[PDB]
Design an enzyme around this catalytic site. Sequence first.
Site, PDB file in Angstrom:
ATOM      1  N   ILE A  17      13.852  29.091  67.594  1.00 43.71           N
ATOM      2  CA  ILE A  17      14.637  30.133  66.949  1.00 43.71           C
ATOM      3  C   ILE A  17      15.713  29.501  66.064  1.00 43.71           C
ATOM      4  O   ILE A  17      16.335  28.503  66.440  1.00 43.71           O
ATOM      5  CB  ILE A  17      15.298  31.052  68.005  1.00 43.71           C
ATOM      6  CG1 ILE A  17      14.220  31.650  68.915  1.00 43.71           C
ATOM      7  CG2 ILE A  17      16.083  32.158  67.321  1.00 43.71           C
ATOM      8  CD1 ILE A  17      14.763  32.501  70.049  1.00 43.71           C
ATOM      9  N   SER A  22      18.822  18.826  64.678  1.00 44.65           N
ATOM     10  CA  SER A  22      19.854  18.314  65.589  1.00 44.65           C
ATOM     11  C   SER A  22      19.753  18.882  67.007  1.00 44.65           C
ATOM     12  O   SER A  22      19.591  18.143  67.983  1.00 44.65           O
ATOM     13  CB  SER A  22      21.250  18.617  65.025  1.00 44.65           C
ATOM     14  OG  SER A  22      21.468  17.960  63.788  1.00 44.65           O
ATOM     15  N   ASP A 133      35.400  30.301  62.612  1.00 47.37           N
ATOM     16  CA  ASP A 133      34.205  30.231  61.787  1.00 47.37           C
ATOM     17  C   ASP A 133      33.359  31.486  61.906  1.00 47.37           C
ATOM     18  O   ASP A 133      32.156  31.453  61.688  1.00 47.37           O
ATOM     19  CB  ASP A 133      33.382  29.015  62.195  1.00 47.37           C
ATOM     20  CG  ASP A 133      32.501  28.496  61.075  1.00 47.37           C
ATOM     21  OD1 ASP A 133      33.039  28.084  60.019  1.00 47.37           O
ATOM     22  OD2 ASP A 133      31.271  28.498  61.260  1.00 47.37           O
TER      23      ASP A 133
END
Length: 259
Positions: A17, A22, A133
């Site tokens: 998903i 990373s 963020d």
Amino acid sequence: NECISVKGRIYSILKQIGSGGSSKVFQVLNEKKQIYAIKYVNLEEADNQTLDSYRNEIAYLNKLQQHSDKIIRLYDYEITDQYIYMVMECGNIDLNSWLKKKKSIDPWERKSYWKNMLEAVHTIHQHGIVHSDLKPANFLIVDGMLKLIDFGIANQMVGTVNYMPPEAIKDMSISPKSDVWSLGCILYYMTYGKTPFQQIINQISKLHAIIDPNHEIEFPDIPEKDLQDVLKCCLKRDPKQRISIPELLAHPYVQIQTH
């Protein structure tokens, strides 16, 4: 068969998903068919800080679960020197996909989702955490209820600057108010199907418009007048002037009942 183990338990993976490099997140099925989500971080690349960031994210995420059902649930996880396995709630769909998908959200939904965001964010602020963020992707729709998937602590899985607050830029050479601006940009987008500075394409331009006091943001009059005020107050360029999470939880738009 397909089997992932977490502290002695098997889970049948179903599909990657979002990310793919990373770190890696997958949808999954366990014993009692119950469907979950398994996030995986390969620590054989992480620096101390990265490592510490995930440790810190997990700690907080684990602790704050009990304080609110508006924060993604972490049922279990496994930490090793080489990897991290987190068993979390499955994602129906993220507020971002949902948005750019259709384009005519029910006012009652807007408000309901808004209450969800405020609760989650307020919760993290209470423990001294500023997301910094926030963008629509940070929220997952689960059973009609929006939930914060992350705390912005770990460098968790493009790169918009539309939700970025004036003070973040100006300072270049943080406060809870910063999360208010972004949540504002998200509400503003659920109100005008567009972001405050979405029409400014050149990136160096948006950044200058976001901080320019003379670049009056626009607020097209609409029926829900309480909604109009929230937006304007959430977008005041001066963080000291910007409304707070507590004030927002007491605002008409959130308090007065009109389904």
